Structures are given as C-alpha cells and as structure tokens.
Amino acid sequence: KVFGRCELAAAMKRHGLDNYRGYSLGNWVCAAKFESNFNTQATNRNTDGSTDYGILQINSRWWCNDGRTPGSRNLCNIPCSALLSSDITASVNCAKKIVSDGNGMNAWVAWRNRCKGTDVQAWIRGCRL
Numbered sequence: 001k002v003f004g005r006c007e008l009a010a011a012m013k014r015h016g017l018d019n020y021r022g023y024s025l026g027n028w029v030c031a032a033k034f035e036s037n038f039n040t041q042a043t044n045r046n047t048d049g050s051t052d053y054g055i056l057q058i059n060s061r062w063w064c065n066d067g068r069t070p071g072s073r074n075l076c077n078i079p080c081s082a083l084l085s086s087d088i089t090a091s092v093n094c095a096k097k098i099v100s101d102g103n104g105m106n107a108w109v110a111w112r113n114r115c116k117g118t119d120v121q122a123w124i125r126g127c128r129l
C-alpha cells in the first residue's frame with residue numbers, strides 16, 4: 001500500500017507515534033517519506049547482506065527475521081514480511097523498539113539526513129488530525 005501523507009499521519013497517530021519518546025508526529029511522517037516513499041512494500045538490500053523492510057525500512061540485521069541474514073537478531077520477534085503489510089501495526093510496534101534502543105531516530109539514516117533539524121511539522125500541516 002502506498003499511503004497519502006495525511007492518511008499515514010493519521011494511522012501513525014492512532015498507533016501512538018505522535019510524541020513517542022519525544023518525537024513529534026511530523027518526524028515519523030518525514031522519515032517514512034524518505035525511507036520508503038510511503039510504500040509499505042518497499043525493500044532495499046544492504047551491502048552487509050541485510051535488507052530493509054517496509055514503510056520505515058526496518059533492517060533484518062537486528063529487528064526481524066528474513067532467513068537470509070546470517071548472524072543477525074530478531075529483536076522485534078517478527079518475520080520481516082510482516083513489515084510489508086498494508087496494516088502498519090507491526091512496523092509501528094517495531095519502530096517503538098528501535099527508537100528506544102539508545103540512538104533515538106538517528107537509527108533512521110534518512111531521518112538524520114533529511115528530517116532532523118528541519119521544520120518537521122510541515123509534514124502534518126493541512127491534515128485532519
């Protein structure tokens with residue numbers, strides 16, 4: 001599923017991301033735009049052999065099982081495929097774990113490079129929230 005901006009903001013808010021660990025909703029919408037272009041089916045292979053999955057591009061080295069990342073963990077206790085669903089529940093639940101890990105939203109390279117320090121509220125402007 002490819003979300004609209006406000007549609008995604010609304011789903012994220014309902015799943016409790018607005019202000020989660022102090023990150024305003026616009027941070028999460030911004031991260032999703034640049035990680036996945038709001039596409040839940042987005043995948044990207046990394047040099048280390050891990051793969052990023054879903055709307056928040058969650059990586060198999062640590063967070064999910066895909067059966068093909070030797071030596072990896074599955075901290076969210078889910079198959080990576082769960083992160084590709086039209087229903088964002090699994091991605092949000094796992095994202096809450098990631099952002100709690102120690103580095104906050106710096107765990108998302110696109111967030112650090114394209115969202116951090118910008119007017120992130122702009123991502124939720126105009127939305128009925």
Ligand SMILES: [Cl-]
Pocket residue numbers: 065066067068069070071072
């Ligand atoms: Cl694996």
Ligand SMILES: [Cl-]
Pocket residue numbers: 021022103104105
């Ligand atoms: Cl933080």
Ligand code: NA
Pocket residue numbers: 060061062063064065066069072073074
């Ligand atoms: Na894994």
